[PDB]
Amino acid sequence: KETKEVYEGEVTELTPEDAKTISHVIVGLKSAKGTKTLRLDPTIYESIQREKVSIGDVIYIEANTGAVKRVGRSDAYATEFDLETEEYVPLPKGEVHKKKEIVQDVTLHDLDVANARPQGGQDV
């Protein structure tokens, strides 16, 4: 029995706080139903800097696992240039904070395989 928690929306505020080591990360997401401002540990900023997330990028954050996925930029910044390499996704009409109860059905062989990778682990 596991809990899926998802924060999604347009990034309207990305302010780090150091002490060259980031201490906490303030991220303000925005959807059609409102905004939500979250603290974040530096590992999620490491994942965000991997994802090159800037201001205005509609992103996906899982609270329990820390998975960060960049959907794309918003339509509010779709007219900053006439032609642009970025893709543009609309503002999500749902809420920023979504909670879900899901059931994980695994087997013993799946855990045996995941604990006995001969070369090593791989990314998501």
Binding site: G72, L83, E84, T85, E87, H109, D110, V113, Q122
Partner: protein, 82 residues
């Protein structure tokens, strides 16, 4: 350069040079109609390709190298359910 016929995907950013236009001063006809086009592409992907891609041990290159190497049955069941 000037006179080149190119195709641009706005999302991925891939720019493909289709060739040069019909100008003496390889050769492809200039496109007609709209510029920003919305066309439907149709894909047919076999279940073995999704089996190879969903298998985390080897990537999509095993469809060409051929070293898939005994894809497990749980990946097969996940592909069937999806």
């Amino acid at each position: 350069l000037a006179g080149d016929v190119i195709s641009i995907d706005k999302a991925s950013g891939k720019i493909t040079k289709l060739g040069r236009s019909f100008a003496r001063s390889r050769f492809v006809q200039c496109p007609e109609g709209e510029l920003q086009k919305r066309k439907t592409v149709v894909h047919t992907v076999s279940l073995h390709e999704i089996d190879v891609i969903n298998s985390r041990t080897q990537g999509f290159l095993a469809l060409f190298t051929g070293d898939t190497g005994e894809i497990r049955s749980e990946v097969r069941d996940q592909i069937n359910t999806k």
